[PDB]
Write a protein that binds this ligand. Structure first.
Ligand SMILES: CCC(=O)N(c1ccccc1)C1CCN(CCc2ccccc2)CC1
Lengths: 215, 209
């Protein structure tokens, strides 16, 4: 089966150019299908950007048409998107997708996983504070305080610790800044001897911290 | 333009109907996608009425001229998702999408919240700041009230609380943050987070080390 995978920078400066590439595997760019980009701002609906045929013929959303370039590269089996003069309205998850196009109708039959691209203007790096943790179970965590914009990712022990992890939705404070907490529930018995590290990454401000959480 | 309702809610086992209306549907047909959080859309109904082979039999589609309908019989909790209808414009130049319909599945069992309360970290206090963090999880329905106390007196200023949000296991989570000066923190004997849910309260207390 054909698979699609987006790649490219997740952060763009205002007025800069968003650049993404879709690697097609399992099948050829050359085919009866058209190739396309669709985006979805967080919490909003789907918006089609445009489509390209393997020969290079393009067709774009007329509300974007002045800023969009879609290209195909059969030697690498890829098709690409450039979106110029970006603003905050371009922050979105970008999907590549395969279209089935007949003489009178079309639809989408295959989608990439989607990649978030954020247009970063103002930004603020968070502080990361440990939330230190008897019998029973124990809660410990990390507070990621006062960052902008979203998002932050949190993992624990480099992704090795998954069970019992709950990273809470961020709060938007009256300050206009975000905070969030990530908590893991562990056996009280593992505390004396298991090391717990929360891996925080706020890419808009290049804040990448691995914070040890100790009693 | 395609028009679909922003929300539909159904009880488990009932039949959900989501309509999509637009003048292009007769010639350009309608296609339905299901989309769950952090996932790409998935085609569930092709060309008005066709069900793709991997899609459960309870999904079906119908057409009624300038309306098309997605019907889910015997709705399950797993069907809660956004649903998009899609067509094309009258000149067959571009796709059109509806705004999406959130399907909510009602009738989950009530569940009382768990509450964890953390004091300020030593690192924060050294930065001349103090935050108490009250984390509230695994409750249903998705309404809670949080009250903070300094000793036993109510604290109102410096409070930030999220609106409850649905977790992966279909129960809700919320969090509440109390900002203090380190002088406030050390002066009182303790602070407490009181979480009220459907008339029952759970309280947690913390104190300076
Ligand atoms: C003779 C030219 C022609 O036929 N076209 C065209 C027009 C302008 C510029 C390049 C090509 C078509 C326009 C429509 N797209 C499909 C739109 C779509 C996609 C996904 C779901 C629904 C609809 C296919 C190519």
């Amino acid at each position: 089966q054909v698979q699609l995978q987006e790649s490219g920078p997740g952060l763009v400066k205002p007025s800069g150019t968003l650049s993404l590439t879709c690697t097609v595997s399992g099948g050829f760019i050359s085919s009866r299908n058209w190739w396309s980009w669709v985006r979805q701002p967080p919490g909003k609906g789907l918006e089609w950007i445009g489509e390209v045929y393997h020969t290079g013929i393009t067709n774009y959303n007329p509300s974007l048409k002045s800023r969009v370039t879609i290209s195909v590269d059969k030697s690498k089996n890829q098709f690409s998107l450039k979106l110029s003069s970006v603003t905050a309205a371009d922050t979105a998850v970008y999907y590549c997708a395969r279209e089935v196009v007949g003489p009178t109708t079309g639809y989408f039959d295959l989608w990439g996983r989607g990649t978030l691209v954020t247009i970063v203007s103002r930004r603020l790096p968070p502080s990361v504070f440990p939330l230190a943790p008897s019998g029973g179970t124990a809660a410990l965590g990390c507070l990621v305080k006062d960052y902008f914009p979203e998002p932050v990712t949190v993992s624990w022990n480099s992704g090795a610790l998954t069970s019992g992890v709950h990273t809470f939705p961020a709060v938007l404070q009256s300050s206009g800044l975000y905070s969030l907490s990530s908590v893991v529930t562990v056996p009280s018995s593992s505390l004396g001897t298991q090391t717990y590290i929360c891996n925080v990454n706020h890419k808009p401000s290049n804040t990448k911290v691995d914070k040890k959480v100790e009693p | 333009e395609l028009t679909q309702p922003p929300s539909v809610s159904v009880s488990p086992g009932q039949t959900a109907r989501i309509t999509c209306s637009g003048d292009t549907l007769p010639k350009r047909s309608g296609y339905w996608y299901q989309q769950k959080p952090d996932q790409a859309p998935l085609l569930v109904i092709n060309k008005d009425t066709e069900r793709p082979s991997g899609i459960p039999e309870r999904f079906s589609g119908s057409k009624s001229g300038t309306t098309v309908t997605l019907t889910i019989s015997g709705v399950q909790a797993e069907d809660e998702a956004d649903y998009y209808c899609q067509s094309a414009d009258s000149s067959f130049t571009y796709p059109s999408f509806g705004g999406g319909t959130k399907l909510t599945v009602l009738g989950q069992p009530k569940a009382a919240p768990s509450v964890t309360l953390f004091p300020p970290s030593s690192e924060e206090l050294q930065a001349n700041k103090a935050t108490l963090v009250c984390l509230i999880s695994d409750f249903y329905p998705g309404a809670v009230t949080v009250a903070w106390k300094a000793d036993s007196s109510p604290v109102k200023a410096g409070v930030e609380t999220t609106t409850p949000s649905k977790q992966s296991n279909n129960k809700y989570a919320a969090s509440s943050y109390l900002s203090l000066t380190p002088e406030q923190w050390k002066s009182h004997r303790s602070y407490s987070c009181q979480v009220t849910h459907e008339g029952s309260t759970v309280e947690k207390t913390v104190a300076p080390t």
